[PDB]
Each structure stands twice: as C-alpha cells, then as structure tokens.
Amino acid sequence: VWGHTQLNRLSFLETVPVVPLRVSDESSEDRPTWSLPDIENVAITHKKPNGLVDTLAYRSVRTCRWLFDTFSLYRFGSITESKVISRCLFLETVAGVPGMVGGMLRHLSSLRYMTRDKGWINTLLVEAENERMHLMTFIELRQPGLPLRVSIIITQAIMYLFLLVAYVISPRFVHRFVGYLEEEAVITYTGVMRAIDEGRLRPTKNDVPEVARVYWNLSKNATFRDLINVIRADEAEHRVVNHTFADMHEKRLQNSVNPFVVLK
Amino acid sequence: VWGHTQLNRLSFLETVPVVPLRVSDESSEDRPTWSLPDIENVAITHKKPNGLVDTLAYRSVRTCRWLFDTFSLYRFGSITESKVISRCLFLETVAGVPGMVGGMLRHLSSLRYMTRDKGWINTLLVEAENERMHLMTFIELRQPGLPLRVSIIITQAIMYLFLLVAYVISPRFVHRFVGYLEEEAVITYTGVMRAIDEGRLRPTKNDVPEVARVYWNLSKNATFRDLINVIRADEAEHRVVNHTFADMHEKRLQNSVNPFVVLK
Ligand SMILES: CCCCc1cc(=O)oc2c(O)c(O)ccc12
Ligand SMILES: CCCCc1cc(=O)oc2c(O)c(O)ccc12
Ligand SMILES: [Fe+3]
Ligand SMILES: [Fe+3]
Ligand SMILES: [Fe+3]
Ligand SMILES: [Fe+3]
C-alpha cells in the first residue's frame, strides 16, 4: 500500500498517535535463526596472533578483561545472576560500537571512492544491531543504577573515539581486536551456561523478554539458559566474522567479496 | 547450514578466492519495490517551514542548489546525458551521508541510555544504503574524471563533519535539511523525465546496469527513464520520511515509534 499517493503527502506526523509499539520493529528484519541443540556445541577457540598488530590487539583485549574483572568484582564474591546481567548490560554498550563505526567508515569510502563494497557494510551494521539487541534484552532483565548509567556514558566517549581512529589507522587491528573480544564473550557465556547447568546459579529470569523472543524466534517456554546460549552463538558468529575480516585485511583482501554473504 | 561447526572455525580466509561476486550482495535485502505506472505520478511538493530552524534549513538548501547549479554549468548549456549523470553522481556521494550519521547517532544514543529506538535506526540505515546504490548505478553509466573524484573527497570531509555536528545540535534541523533537499531531488529527476519525454534528451545507456536491475527489480527491457523514474520515487520517499522525522522532532516525538515501520 506504499504508493505515490503516500509518497506525495508532505508529512506523516499526524499518524504517530495511531501506530503501535511493536517489538518486531525494534530490530531490522535480519534476525539470527539459531536452532538450540546445535548451538549448544559452540566452543572456546583461540586464533593465534600473527604480527605485532594481532598481538597488540590481544594484549589490549587481555588488559581490558583484567581491568573490567577487578573493578567489576567479578573475581571476589559469588556468581550472582545480578552481577552477570549488570556485567553484560555494561558490555553490550560497547559491543554495539565496532560494528557501527566499521560500517559507517566503509560506507564513507564506498561513497567517496565510488566503488562496490561487496556486502561488508551490511554485515558490520547488523553485528552492531545484533549487539544492540543484547543490550535491549539485558535492560529488560535489570535496570542499572545511576553509577552504571554514568560509567556507560564516559566509556562510550572513550570507545567511540578509540574505535573511530583505531579503524581509520587500522581496520585490521579492530576486526582482530573484536575477534579477540568475542572469544572472551564466548568464554563468559559458556562459563555462565556451565554455571546454570552445574546448579551454581539459579536464574529468576526464566521469563525471556518479548524483544528477545521475536528477535531470536524462541518458544514462550524458553529458559534463561536458552537466551544466554543463542547470544553465545551470536558471539561466536562475530568471533569468526571479524577474525575473517582481520585476515582478509592481512592479505590485502580488504576489497574482496565478504565471504559470509555467500555462507548464509 | 550456518551452525556450530562453522562458528567454531578460527577463519574463512580460505573461501575468499572461491566465492562469487553477485550484484545482489552489494545491498542488504531491504530493497525498494515500486511499480512504474503508479510512481509515474510522483509529484513535486513543498513543505512550509515553521521555525527559524526550518527556514535556516531551507535557505541553506537553496544556497547549495544555487552554488551547485552555478559551479556545474547547468544554468548555461544544452542539457546532456553526461552532465545529468555527472551531477547525480557527485550528489549521491553527499546523499549517502545524512542517513549514516543519523543512524549511527540514534544507535549510539540507544546504547548509552539503554533505551528503545523504535526502528528509526534501520530506516535511516536503508535511507543511506539506498542512496549509495543510486551512486553504484551512476558509477556504471559513467566513470567520473579526476577533478570530480577529488571534489568528491574534499566534499565528503566538509559534509561528514557538518552533519555530524548539525545532528548533535539539532537533528530537527538536519532531518528538515534533508527533507528540503529531497524536494529538489524530485524536481530534478522529474525534469529529467520530462526532458526524455519532450525529446530534448536522448539517453544512450538503455542498458540498465545489473546492480540496479536487481536492486530495483526491473525487467531486462527497463529503459533509462525507467531507472530515473524509480530513483525519483526513492528520493520522494526520503522527502516525506525526513520531513515527518523533522516534524516528529518539532513536537518532541523523537522517541515515538518511527511511523514508517508499519507503513512498510
Ligand atoms: C573484556 C572482555 C569482556 C568479556 C565479555 C563478558 C561478557 O559478559 O559479555 C561479553 C559480551 O557480550 C561481548 O559482546 C563481548 C565481551 C564480553
Ligand atoms: C543541493 C541541491 C541538489 C538537488 C538535487 C539535484 C539533482 O540533480 O539530484 C539530486 C539527488 O540525486 C539527490 O539525491 C538529492 C538532491 C539532488
Ligand atoms: Fe555481546
Ligand atoms: Fe560482542
Ligand atoms: Fe539521490
Ligand atoms: Fe537523496
């Protein structure tokens, strides 16, 4: 029904009163579609670093873990559900930026040079969205306090800036860095899952939010375990896809067709 | 078959030299679908400015039309296909930016305030992608000179910066500034279609580029006019959508469900 008669109306401000809040509309239509007993078998991998650069990405990813563990007192206390979420929550605020700047920089090159991109730009932009939906999911499980609100904001500053220039200077470094982060992402979500299983953590969000049901297409019966596990598969996708974009950069392949447009 | 076994592999660098370059993958799959006899009737509109803001937007967008027409010898020549393609090519290198800075900002706000976006983001993201396809098409009907190829980059720098700080200060301003740009894009692309029809322009690439032919889903018999015709629809879509957004801004509805999610 989207025709020239709609196209020719000056504005549509007067229709915002009558248009529902739909949870399907929070995301773009490009949703993951994992099946659960498969992705159960996601596993902690570690790509060896080649050069200085891959190493620098590592040491700095490792240093970021160290910091964010000591200061988040993940290390001293007991694995609560409240410090698991409160942790990811913070962490998805940053997870949404290296997708987005990567897309937005590639897109500017592809405009200015006037050149085909071969479906990088969209894969990166959805990683950015995919992570944003982790954050839209975790926010439903736990609204954080003024402290964390403000630590997210200063941090976004630091990061949006670091990622913008680190990506100008070295897309290889960023894709390699995000790659290294996502190994940790996957450890943190398989550790969590190990914990639910063993019984060392008994989660009271066995309601899975409406956003997260339609986005990941799960049953209404989907447990908290399930939700970690699909997100743990999203994070494995990112682990390879950016370590793939890393290597492509390594071998001057940073303008080849993105192999994953095929491999969907 | 995108399951754990793939997700568990360190790279896919191997595959890169055996995966094809298919013109579909250049875009996301969130493609336009018009039919030509309907969007034949797309009109030239003009929204009233309310504020000193909407005014400013309008006067900036007119001064830009003036400049561009004057520095592009459009005012003093027999309209060629060359200068039509040349003007439209340059321009999509600036159309491709607002959607991208708009989208990313809304994204970064959603991440740091941990709040819903309600599907503005992905709209501004396919706003920008669509534009960039306009440019991928025009690149193929005419590869530009060095002197334009330069101008393009110095332009991007100015504009990327401008829109980034405009969009922080008043997206209402920018979304208007686009709204009033797309009014002038429709004017032109109609004029062009008139000029084909009145016989005064004899287009020589009625081979419509593969990129486009898939993107806009046209026949193999699709003419140049036919392409102009759709591109113009897209441009009039962006005209309402941005004015709507600048209208929503104006009434403090920059958090309301993007009306157009539904109208899709
Ligand atoms: C500095 C490494 C942080 C690891 C991490 C833990 C987590 O709980 O969730 C993450 C996560 O959701 C990511 O996307 C990336 C990294 C993590
Ligand atoms: C700065 C005014 C430009 C108007 C305009 C003319 C044109 O020939 O093509 C356009 C175009 O392709 C757009 O996407 C936006 C604006 C124009
Ligand atoms: Fe994550
Ligand atoms: Fe991540
Ligand atoms: Fe355009
Ligand atoms: Fe445009």
From Swiss-Prot, chains A, B:
Q: How does it sit in the membrane?
A: Multi-pass membrane protein
A single GO molecular function term of this UniProt record:
alternative oxidase activity
Task: Tell me where it mainly resides.
Answer: mitochondrion
Q: Might you give the EC number(s) for this enzyme? A: 1.-.-.-
Q: Which residues bind Fe cation 2?
A: 131, 182, 235, 238
Binding site residues for Fe cation 1? 92, 131, 134, 235
Record note on cofactor: Binds 2 iron ions per subunit.
Q: Which GO terms describe its biological process?
A: alternative respiration
State whether keyword Metal-binding applies: yes
The entry's cellular-component GO terms read: mitochondrial inner membrane; mitochondrion
Q: Which UniProt keywords apply?
A: Disulfide bond, Electron transport, Iron, Membrane, Metal-binding, Mitochondrion, Mitochondrion inner membrane, Oxidoreductase, Respiratory chain, Transit peptide, Transmembrane, Transmembrane helix, Transport
Q: Which domain of life is it from?
A: Eukaryota
What function does the entry list? Catalyzes cyanide-resistant oxygen consumption. May increase respiration when the cytochrome respiratory pathway is restricted, or in response to low temperatures.
Q: How does it assemble?
A: Homodimer; disulfide-linked.
Record-given protein name? Alternative oxidase, mitochondrial
